[PDB]
Amino acid sequence: HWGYGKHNGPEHWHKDFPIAKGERQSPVDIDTHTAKYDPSLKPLSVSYDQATSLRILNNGHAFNVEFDDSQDKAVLKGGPLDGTYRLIQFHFHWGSLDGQGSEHTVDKKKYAAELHLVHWNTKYGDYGKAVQQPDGLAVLGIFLKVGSAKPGLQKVVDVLDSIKTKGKSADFTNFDPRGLLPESLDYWTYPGSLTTPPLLECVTWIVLKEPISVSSEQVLKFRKLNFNGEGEPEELMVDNWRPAQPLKNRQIKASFK
Numbered sequence: 001h002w003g004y005g006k007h008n009g010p011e012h013w014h015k016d017f018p019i020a021k022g023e024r025q026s027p028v029d030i031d032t033h034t035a036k037y038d039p040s041l042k043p044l045s046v047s048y049d050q051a052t053s054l055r056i057l058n059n060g061h062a063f064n065v066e067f068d069d070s071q072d073k074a075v076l077k078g079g080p081l082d083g084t085y086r087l088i089q090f091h092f093h094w095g096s097l098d099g100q101g102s103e104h105t106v107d108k109k110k111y112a113a114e115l116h117l118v119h120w121n122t123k124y125g126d127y128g129k130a131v132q133q134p135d136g137l138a139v140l141g142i143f144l145k146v147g148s149a150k151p152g153l154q155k156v157v158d159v160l161d162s163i164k165t166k167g168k169s170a171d172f173t174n175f176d177p178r179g180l181l182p183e184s185l186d187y188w189t190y191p192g193s194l195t196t197p198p199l200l201e202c203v204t205w206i207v208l209k210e211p212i213s214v215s216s217e218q219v220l221k222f223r224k225l226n227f228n229g230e231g232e233p234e235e236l237m238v239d240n241w242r243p244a245q246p247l248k249n250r251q252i253k254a255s256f257k
């Protein structure tokens with residue numbers, strides 16, 4: 001229905017998802033001079049030692065690496081968060097060239113891509129209930145710039161030709177998402193939304209300040225995926241990012257001075 005094409009992209013989404021023009025939409029531009037250091041924020045606790053990846057899926061708009069979220073294995077806590085958020089999946093947004101691809105921007109700078117690690121608040125019991133609540137999800141966002149290769153990304157890269165088209169999946173067990181993190185966990189945070197339909201306003205965004213570096217060859221492989229299904233006219237999966245939305249009555253807080 002919706003997508004990132006020439007006729008169904010972000011500027012059209014509001015016609016079927018009117019919350020697209022809402023008061024807490026994501027992504028946003030992070031103005032680094034306006035974001036205030038908040039001494040009351042805590043260090044993030046990223047606890048992925050027991051993560052169980054299961055499968056990788058091309059869903060027609062990105063690829064999702066899915067985790068076993070049937071109990072508290074990989075969780076996110078601390079930072080701006082109360083309680084425990086379970087990792088359900090991660091995916092990326094990226095561009096057709098290195099000068100665009102991220103959803104969040106930093107002083108209007110676009111990165112080549114952006115990783116989203118999606119977690120749901122276990123106090124609501126299941127993901128479907130969590131997305132109906134203003135504190136239902138926590139998404140950890142990590143920028144990608146092009147430079148040296150990211151060793152921990154290569155296993156993802158190498159499975160992509162097996163899920164080229166929409167609706168294809170493959171086994172993807174024993175993947176360690178810790179290999180996708182930067183050194184520092186300094187972050188910005190603000191209340192927002194899902195960045196694809198249904199655009200629900202249920203997310204506490206935690207965006208890391210430090211980008212990870214990936215190689216040109218790695219991101220080039222992202223750009224060989226297809227939005228289309230098998231046998232259909234080839235549409236390269238590129239520019240699957242929503243642009244920055246109005247900040248409205250929101251404050252972006254920094255965990256660092």
Ligand SMILES: NS(=O)(=O)c1nc2ccccc2s1
Nearest residue numbers: 001002007008012013015016
């Ligand atoms: N409003 S939307 O979900 O982005 C959407 N755009 C289009 C364009 C052509 C046909 C169906 C739909 S559904």
Ligand SMILES: NS(=O)(=O)c1nc2ccccc2s1
Nearest residue numbers: 116118139194195196197198
């Ligand atoms: N791109 S994101 O805000 O991380 C995100 N959006 C959506 C939409 C529907 C279902 C899951 C997710 S996760």
Ligand SMILES: [Zn+2]
Nearest residue numbers: 091093116195
């Ligand atoms: Zn995303």
